[PDB]
Symmetry: C3
Subunit: 333 residues, 3 copies
Amino acid sequence: DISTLPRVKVDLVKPPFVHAHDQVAKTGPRVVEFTMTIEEKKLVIDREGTEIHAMTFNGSVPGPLMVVHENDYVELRLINPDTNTLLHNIDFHAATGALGGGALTQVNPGEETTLRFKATKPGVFVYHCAPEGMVPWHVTSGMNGAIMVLPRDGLKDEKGQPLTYDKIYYVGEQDFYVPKDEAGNYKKYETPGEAYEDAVKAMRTLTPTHIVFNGAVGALTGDHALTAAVGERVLVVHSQANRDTRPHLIGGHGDYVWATGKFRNPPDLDQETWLIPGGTAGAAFYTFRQPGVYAYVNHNLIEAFELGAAGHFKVTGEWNDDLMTSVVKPASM
Amino acid sequence: DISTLPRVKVDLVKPPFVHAHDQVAKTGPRVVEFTMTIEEKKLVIDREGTEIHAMTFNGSVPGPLMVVHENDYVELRLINPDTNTLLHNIDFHAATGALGGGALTQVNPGEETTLRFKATKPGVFVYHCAPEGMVPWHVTSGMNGAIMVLPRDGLKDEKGQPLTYDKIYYVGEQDFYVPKDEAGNYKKYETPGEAYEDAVKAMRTLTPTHIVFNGAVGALTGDHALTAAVGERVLVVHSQANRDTRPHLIGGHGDYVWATGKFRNPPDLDQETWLIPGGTAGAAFYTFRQPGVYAYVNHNLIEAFELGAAGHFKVTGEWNDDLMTSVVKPASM
Amino acid sequence: DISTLPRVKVDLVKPPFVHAHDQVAKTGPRVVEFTMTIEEKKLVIDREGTEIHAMTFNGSVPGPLMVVHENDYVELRLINPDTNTLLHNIDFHAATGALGGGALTQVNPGEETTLRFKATKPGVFVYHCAPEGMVPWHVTSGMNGAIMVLPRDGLKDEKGQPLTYDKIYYVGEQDFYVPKDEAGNYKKYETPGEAYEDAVKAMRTLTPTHIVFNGAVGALTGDHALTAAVGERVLVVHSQANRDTRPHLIGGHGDYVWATGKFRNPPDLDQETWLIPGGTAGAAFYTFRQPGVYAYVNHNLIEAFELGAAGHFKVTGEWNDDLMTSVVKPASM
Ligand SMILES: O=N[O-]
Ligand SMILES: O=N[O-]
Ligand SMILES: O=N[O-]
Ligand SMILES: [Cu+2]
Ligand SMILES: [Cu+2]
Ligand SMILES: [Cu+2]
Ligand SMILES: [Cu+2]
Ligand SMILES: [Cu+2]
Ligand SMILES: [Cu+2]
């Protein structure tokens, strides 16, 4: 009787931050209550000022990271305000049945719905909007996030020993397909219906115009760089709802990686780069050993440095000259 | 002395169905005899009526799934009737030597050949035509299938316990490269030789025009949807002879997945999505827990919903409201 | 005190060959000294005579394979002669800190530098140039190689038993983006600065014009085919610094594969094809069982046979008719 279970309300935070949670479950199974409000909004996604009509969960690209434990129940109140124009829904890859919930959550502007599902499998998973007949358009407009279902006894390494992170970040990577004219300039549109065919044409090229973290070129840089201290253990959850990516921490590694995101599997050790398939969330655990600036990228380096799939860590602490040193600094022959 | 071994003749069936076999070998090693007849034929591959000159094994795209046990011998009689126009052959990724058999099986129209190889490694494997100098053209014309080499004691989970499927399906995923004119319309051709350069140009874009299951958009839908019952254990073998794919069961999971298809490895558990590299077969085992319609896709959702890489399951049985329920159906604020 | 450790100077060799080393470390930890000289040079990369301005480490595409043991120190003297025109550096994915060394190794023409780092993680790893603001341009001009960090007790299988190779080869796979005019012909350029915008435009298509092994179409064929004998154990290290690849030995397998290249993980067994993500090195171990010509490809077969990603083995020895035989050679119905 689910009515006999504790309810806990989560208050979500904007990526790349993650709402408060316990790695090791401090209670029995719970109904974990989430509310998200769909927001269609204009977003500037690059340095040139290219502006798209984004389709978001809770105002952000990606949508926020939801965190529960295995065999909790996720109960999501999904709100589509009458300020929006389109029908939306939600598919949880973590859930079982009804297209991940998409068949049960169709909300027109001015409607809401509440979905409950049992989180029976531990892992990080994509969630995304998926309205029948317009699925890739919603997804590639930004309407996707992730949910982490932690094992009730937290994470474990390949030998069954605990892995405990000190910090977690959620990197949502988004492929956009901004329609171009024959000369190669981006087109803009009066209404979503006038945009639709050109959106479909642009998607069918299979060539993103932009690939970004946290919704825009440079979003995880400067005053919004990710941070860590030397010696800190950091989990980076990374999702891509529509296209493969190959994350890499420039100057570091994935000490333990679940490339396809499912924690009943032993992690891959010592990864330089790992493949997260489109439609998947993955997670990488790293203990920082050196201070300084790191870049965290999709290691198709064109996708990283030309199309936007690059963020930064700023890491504080002492430099270890045993691990790396400039023996002879650049100088002239 | 191979002549002292039992011979068993297999009678193949059209994908996505799979010929009768035993998971656990009920005999010792056998010479397992297959016959396939090459058929060049016109195929309509989309809803618009786009018609290509397909190159098939046994009349289908994909070619049929062949099933043997580890250390059986596969003996294939490959027939190229004089109604065909081209030279063909066959490369088995399951086989060792002579380019997988391709160097020994070159048949002109009006010829046949018989190849035997020992299936020394368990797994699902691609087979495909591969004539020297025209390899991708044959493959991306549909001339590929798969062979499953089961361990003699059937499949096992990550702990060494048996996994037994109740039903198996074979999903062959095909990238086609239909040549386009400058305006973007598909071109058609009088002869394969007149088609060849434009086929090569279209392939060199690396952008498929179509990505389909079982040879056509919507082939595994409607009256040809895949079926299952709640509680049934289903293995879905999935091949892609030329390009990566990322299968996903919408509303389900891969409970146990061999993403790169080789059963001596422990399966990955609880996958949302998995990457099958181009040139590979993979296999996913799932026990259905909910009735209703599922979609089975390549989770590049553009590839799925715009280019064709989507099929359906229809699943019969009782709905489990513990696992998922609509708490409050969509309604107006 | 690193000054108390043995120093050993390595003399590199041109890919696909690999400098002399011991699988099992015959000494304690060492400072292993390497020198590489950057060479910008023209290279003809295809049969048509297409000539690019390559950016190399030590004159080759890929750069040479460097081999050390876990917890050795790599000390690289990197020389940028004043005959070059550009700034370069080096990022080792094997290293920890300072963007893999890239932040500490910026050398203008006429400068050199010496970097030392501790090789704390065993595996094969990419190294590549990565100058801030021009990273993909350098990488996709050929300026990448790999380093193998062997476990001090050599390689092990999935059960912890030794795997010892008799021969090793290094296959560097390079995606080039030669700018094209509207008609589709390659453009050429007076200076790297005049080339830059068109290089960036060509990269942003995400469609390589060429994908080659060892720097050119057909480089690992003919008198430069890879060789082996029946019964020989061969490790093929394969890198791709910028784009996914899916290696396949036509007629063989990867008996043991580290697809993402890190030897603390058990290898995947019996692979037909494996995915090496862009920004990764992987390694496949195979014992040849049949003589003859093999092709070793990226199993996107368009990428292999049309764009260049194909090499050959010539294997000497006896043919095993148990493993494969032509029962009835091609002949007429
Ligand atoms: O190591 N990242 O380019
Ligand atoms: O969950 N498939 O979109
Ligand atoms: O088996 N390679 O096409
Ligand atoms: Cu939506
Ligand atoms: Cu999905
Ligand atoms: Cu053929
Ligand atoms: Cu093949
Ligand atoms: Cu450089
Ligand atoms: Cu890198």
